[PDB]
Amino acid sequence: DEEKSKMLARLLKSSHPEDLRAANKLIKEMVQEDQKRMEKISKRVNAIEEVNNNVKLLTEMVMSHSQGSSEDLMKELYQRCERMRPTLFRLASDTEDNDEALAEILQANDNLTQVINLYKQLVR
């Protein structure tokens, strides 16, 4: 990260023999990497984002409904949570190279399961 960096800026400012050939090859590499690294983070974030929101929302509703046509936007929301358990689990699986991310996906999932059940605690 910092070594590949110093290395690069070294290969750049210098003659042609190796320097350019290498400098480029190394530029091409990084680019291709930053590409996948990007798409990954992007997926994880939206996923967690989508989850925290649904939880919060459906949580509030199950609260205002614990006393008094929402009983159908509350169900519909709930089933959405169910189908997320999958993607979440499937996500934690590819996140085997970053425990800070993996932990977030996990806690994300805790909230998800916590509310999917709390809803069921009333319907059931």
Side-chain angles (χ1 to χ4, degrees):
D1 299 310
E2 173 58 61
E3 279 296 61
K4 185 146 56 183
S5 176
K6 290 189 177 182
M7 165 86 288
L8 190 54
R10 282 276 180 170
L11 286 172
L12 287 189
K13 195 150 63 179
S14 56
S15 291
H16 283 189
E18 315 147 61
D19 325 72
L20 267 199
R21 295 185 187 179
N24 287 323
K25 184 187 179 64
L26 164 52
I27 292 292
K28 178 174 194 169
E29 281 179 51
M30 312 182 57
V31 163
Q32 302 194 58
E33 285 171 41
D34 292 55
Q35 173 37 58
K36 310 176 183 188
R37 174 186 287 84
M38 221 64 275
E39 287 180 292
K40 253 174 180 291
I41 314 304
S42 180
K43 270 215 170 189
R44 169 172 65 262
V45 191
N46 297 318
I48 312 292
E49 239 287 279
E50 292 184 48
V51 162
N52 312 307
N53 287 333
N54 290 55
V55 171
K56 284 184 188 177
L57 211 173
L58 203 146
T59 279
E60 295 179 303
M61 305 202 27
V62 180
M63 293 311 91
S64 299
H65 189 294
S66 58
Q67 302 113 307
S69 183
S70 284
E71 188 177 300
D72 192 279
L73 167 281
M74 193 167 77
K75 291 187 176 183
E76 185 59 42
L77 203 181
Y78 163 93
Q79 75 186 189
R80 172 50 176 174
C81 288
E82 298 195 313
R83 60 171 64 69
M84 299 215 89
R85 284 284 212 65
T87 41
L88 269 182
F89 183 99
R90 189 157 41 75
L91 240 191
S93 317
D94 313 5
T95 319
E96 53 192 304
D97 43 289
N98 171 174
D99 303 60
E100 214 161 66
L102 177 50
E104 277 158 348
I105 310 184
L106 283 183
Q107 188 157 53
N109 190 300
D110 294 318
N111 309 297
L112 175 53
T113 299
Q114 180 185 304
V115 82
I116 284 188
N117 289 176
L118 173 154
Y119 164 95
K120 269 194 169 180
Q121 181 199 294
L122 310 202
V123 69
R124 176 193 185 189

